[PDB]
Design a protein around this ligand. Structure first.
Ligand SMILES: CC(C)(COP(=O)(O)OP(=O)(O)OC[C@H]1O[C@@H](n2cnc3c(N)ncnc32)[C@H](O)[C@@H]1OP(=O)(O)O)[C@@H](O)C(=O)NCCC(=O)NCCS
Ligand SMILES: O=C(/C=C/c1ccc(O)cc1)O[C@@H]1CC(C(=O)O)=C[C@@H](O)[C@H]1O
Length: 435
């Protein structure tokens, strides 16, 4: 257990006038998981070639500079400085009240960036993000909490906790990367678009699918300690996995996500010892920006996550990657404009969206969640002292939940960070390379 000492904490507020208003949240904003999404950045003090990355003025993640840029970033991104609240009907919304965000600095005088190893999202990493106390008062806590930790090596971590109602990964990183840009002294490219009514349902709502993704996950037909780990597959490993799927003249090419996801689903199902007739459901967060037509404004600030949920008997998934990948890709291919549009209507008709919130019961054995960050700009946060050498989830709250990460370098590898029951992880560790 690492010695981390927090220097002290500050609420940081927008540095100019911002609108005082209630901000309506869309259906997709309300069914993402509860609490604050964790992510952690690591930065080394030297670049690969060994030069010090401190700036000409000697600075290296100077807190004052970072806080000034943060306060500037919270002007156009002002809902990030707000608080949760409810409207008259009890629907959660964002109270844009300039309550501010938490920023704190810490020192870990004994540890180095090297000490974190593969950067698996264990509790070791979670300690790099401020802790939030949740009570029944949902207005009580900041929507954004940040910690900057300084290490013995001269390295730094930035831990980010971002309340999920405010933004999905694309919008959340749009904020962090804009903050980084300001800190670095460059204007940022894209102003956020703040109005979420663009994702309002049609009137009357007219859903035209069952929306399997919002139905209860399968239970076992028939508390445990939960382990967390990270596994890299090289570009060569990924190619060999793909080459195991027959290429036939009729049949269109499966996505890499579908191939890798099928492999993870297969390995997890085997590790868990699922019987062939056990239904299993895989939850795949899908970015609706790439699917809605016409597309949303470029800087649209919110969640645009729709959910693809391949569902099959475990015997199908474990029979082989090819069979699983076909099922996943079909589920992904369903998520077009017509489908995503229908989903908005379907959510509008629900008496209570809190019931659909994805959580532990969603992802746990026999089911799985596999969220890709591969196309997210997770490595673009250069505050003026270099790009991060790693970025990933700061923890995994739920057994059965996993992340696909792109490499921080150019080598074309992918990493899978995953939480499973401890006994199952011991098998999964072996199985993920057993092909
Ligand atoms: C399938 C999906 C659900 C997840 O997959 P993904 O890992 O993010 O990546 P995608 O399927 O979108 O595209 C990656 C592909 O485009 C390739 N690619 C790389 N650069 C590219 C570029 N300029 N242009 C086009 N394709 C490119 C990639 O190599 C890859 O090709 P492949 O599948 O044949 O290997 C996708 O639809 C998606 O939603 N991505 C965003 C995920 C997200 O936001 N998750 C949650 C954050 S809250
Ligand atoms: O992946 C994200 C959020 C990413 C993100 C990254 C960096 C940020 O700054 C903010 C958010 O949301 C995921 C969405 C999700 C779901 O069921 O919809 C389940 C989890 O996998 C979340 O972690």
């Amino acid at each position: 257990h690492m010695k981390i000492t927090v220097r002290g904490s500050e609420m940081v507020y927008p540095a100019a006038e911002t609108p005082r208003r209630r901000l309506w949240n869309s259906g997709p904003d309300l069914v993402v998981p509860r609490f604050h999404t964790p992510s952690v950045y690591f930065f080394r003090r030297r670049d690969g070639e060994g030069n010090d990355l401190a700036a000409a003025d000697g600075s290296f993640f100077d807190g004052a500079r970072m806080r000034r840029a943060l306060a500037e970033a919270l002007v156009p991104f002002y809902p990030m400085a707000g608080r949760l609240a409810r409207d008259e009907d009890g629907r959660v919304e964002i109270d844009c009240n300039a309550g501010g965000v938490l920023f704190q600095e810490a020192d870990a005088p004994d540890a180095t960036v090297d000490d974190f190893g593969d950067f698996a999202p264990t509790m070791e990493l979670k300690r790099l993000i401020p802790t939030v106390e949740y009570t029944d008062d949902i207005s009580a806590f900041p929507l954004l909490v940040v910690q900057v930790t300084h290490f013995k090596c001269g390295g730094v971590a930035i831990g980010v906790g971002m309340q999920h109602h405010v933004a999905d990964g694309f919008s959340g990183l749009h904020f962090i990367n804009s903050w980084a840009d300001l800190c670095r002294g460059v204007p940022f490219a894209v102003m956020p678009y703040i109005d979420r009514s663009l994702l309002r349902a049609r009137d009357p709502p007219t859903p035209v699918y069952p929306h399997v993704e919002y139905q209860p996950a399968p239970a076992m037909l028939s508390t445990p300690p939960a382990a967390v780990a990270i596994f890299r597959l090289s570009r060569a490993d990924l190619g060999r996995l793909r080459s195991q799927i027959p290429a036939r003249e009729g049949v269109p090419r499966l996505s890499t996500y579908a191939v890798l996801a099928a492999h993870v689903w297969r390995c997890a199902s085997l590790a868990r010892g699922l019987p062939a007739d056990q239904p299993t459901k895989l939850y795949c967060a899908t970015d609706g920006r790439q699917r809605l037509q016409p597309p949303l404004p470029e800087g649209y600030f919110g969640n645009v996550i729709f959910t693809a949920t391949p569902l099959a008997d475990a015997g199908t998934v474990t029979a082989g990657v090819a069979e699983g990948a076909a099922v996943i890709q079909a589920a992904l291919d369903r998520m077009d404009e017509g489908y995503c549009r229908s989903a908005l209507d379907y959510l509008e008709l629900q008496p209570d969206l809190s019931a659909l919130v994805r959580g532990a019961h969603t992802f746990r054995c026999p089911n799985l969640g596999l969220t890709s960050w591969v196309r997210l700009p997770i490595h673009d946060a250069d505050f003026g002292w270099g790009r991060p050498v790693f970025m990933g989830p700061g923890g995994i709250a739920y057994e059965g939940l996993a992340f696909v990460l792109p490499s921080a370098n150019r080598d074309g590898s992918l990493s899978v960070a995953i939480s499973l029951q401890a006994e199952h992880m011991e098998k999964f560790r072996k199985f993920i390379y057993d092909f």
